[PDB]
Design an enzyme around this catalytic site. Structure first.
Site, PDB file in Angstrom:
ATOM      1  CG  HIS A  49     -23.909  29.957   7.804  1.00  0.00           C
ATOM      2  ND1 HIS A  49     -23.482  30.382   9.032  1.00  0.00           N
ATOM      3  CD2 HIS A  49     -23.764  31.017   6.969  1.00  0.00           C
ATOM      4  CE1 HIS A  49     -23.083  31.637   8.953  1.00  0.00           C
ATOM      5  NE2 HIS A  49     -23.229  32.063   7.707  1.00  0.00           N
ATOM      6  CE1 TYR A  65     -32.366  30.037   3.251  1.00  0.00           C
ATOM      7  CE2 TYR A  65     -30.628  30.934   1.869  1.00  0.00           C
ATOM      8  CZ  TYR A  65     -31.902  31.018   2.366  1.00  0.00           C
ATOM      9  OH  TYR A  65     -32.703  32.053   1.970  1.00  0.00           O
ATOM     10  CB  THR A  66     -27.692  25.500   8.711  1.00  0.00           C
ATOM     11  OG1 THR A  66     -27.079  26.687   9.172  1.00  0.00           O
ATOM     12  CG2 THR A  66     -26.968  24.252   9.189  1.00  0.00           C
ATOM     13  CB  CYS A 245     -30.204  30.848  15.061  1.00  0.00           C
ATOM     14  SG  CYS A 245     -30.155  31.478  13.351  1.00  0.00           S
TER      15      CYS A 245
END
Ligand SMILES: Cc1cc2nc3c(=O)[nH]c(=O)nc-3n(C[C@H](O)[C@H](O)[C@H](O)COP(=O)(O)OP(=O)(O)OC[C@H]3O[C@@H](n4cnc5c(N)ncnc54)[C@H](O)[C@@H]3O)c2cc1C
Length: 272
Positions: A49, A65-66, A245
């Site tokens: 990420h 953030y991905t 996640c």
């Protein structure tokens, strides 16, 4: 040849310019940022990420953030963001710092990206390289299936891996996703996930749970629990890799205890 990468050094911040903002729904956005040139790629290994960082009301805020883009996209990076507005959830009256800051950005404003980061990299064809820590070497292991438990904004690390697998027609890894949300309306990326199910149902299994369900609901209600893990993740006999996640009470109370009750080795369940 290969395209120039943006994330050359993990130790550098790259201010990227906002070029497009889509209002996906009332509280969901897609933000597109330009890379340094239209021919660059981001340079983000599957499994990893980026971080965004900014001064938000005078204080430093950093969040991971991905992207929903990949290294196949030239010239831009896309982030899908759930905006946590103030005065909406009684336990979080201030809302979310970075997500509201993103919502306030104007086209042309920049924000710092840094990466890649993360202890897991997907090397293809079932093979994951997982560091126990930064300061340690990656334990590779070729699994036949991956169980994925996402809550809320934890979907994008899963989606990135799912897409990398599905686009390799010679990758036989089967992904099983159990995706938890507060409500049906709050689910991120539902059309995208359902397109993958439509196209790849033999390698991609999709299930939802919601804390509270709508009147017409075909999936599960409640927090992730033992039965949902038995019914919607590969069995421990098959030695899947389990990826997670989601918020902290979700991982701690809903996921790890129930992964254990089913017999998965807790200590091998990876949290992004
Ligand atoms: C590897 C990884 C990838 C991620 N990728 C994404 C991504 O692609 N997209 C994305 O949107 N996020 C993603 N996240 C989550 C992201 O890092 C932040 O947690 C998220 O943007 C919220 O940060 P914030 O600063 O706005 O909220 P904070 O100020 O950190 O707020 C703390 C928490 O309060 C809760 N909260 C606050 N207001 C509300 C509200 N109105 N309703 C419900 N809960 C609320 C939220 O759970 C929030 O996380 C990812 C996380 C990880 C670990």
């Amino acid at each position: 040849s290969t395209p120039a990468i943006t994330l050359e050094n993990p130790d550098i911040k790259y201010p990227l310019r906002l070029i497009d903002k889509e209002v996906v729904n009332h509280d969901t956005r897609r933000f597109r940022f330009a890379l340094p040139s239209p021919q660059h790629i981001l340079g983000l290994p599957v499994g990893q990420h980026i971080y965004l960082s900014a001064r938000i009301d005078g204080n430093l805020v950093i969040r991971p953030y991905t992207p929903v883009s990949s290294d196949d996209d030239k010239g831009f990076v896309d982030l899908v963001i759930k905006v946590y507005f103030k005065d909406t959830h009684p336990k979080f009256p201030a809302g979310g710092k970075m997500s509201q800051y993103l919502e306030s950005m104007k086209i042309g404003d920049t924000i710092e990206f840094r990466g890649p980061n993360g202890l897991l990299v997907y090397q293809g064809k079932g093979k994951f390289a997982i560091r126990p820590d930064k300061k340690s070497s990656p334990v590779i292991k070729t699994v036949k299936s991956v169980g994925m438990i996402a809550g809320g904004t934890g979907i994008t690390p899963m989606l990135q891996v799912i897409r990398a697998i599905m686009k390799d027609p010679d990758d036989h890894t089967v992904c099983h996703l159990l995706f938890a949300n507060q409500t049906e309306k709050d689910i991120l990326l539902r059309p995208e996930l359902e397109e993958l199910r439509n196209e790849h149902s033999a390698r991609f299994k999709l299930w939802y749970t919601v804390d509270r369900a709508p009147e017409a609901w075909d999936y599960s209600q409640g927090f992730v629990n033992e039965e949902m893990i038995r019914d919607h993740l590969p069995p421990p006999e098959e030695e899947p890799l389990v990826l997670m996640c989601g918020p902290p009470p979700m991982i701690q109370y809903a996921c790890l205890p129930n992964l254990e009750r089913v017999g998965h080795p807790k200590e091998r369940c990876f949290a992004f």
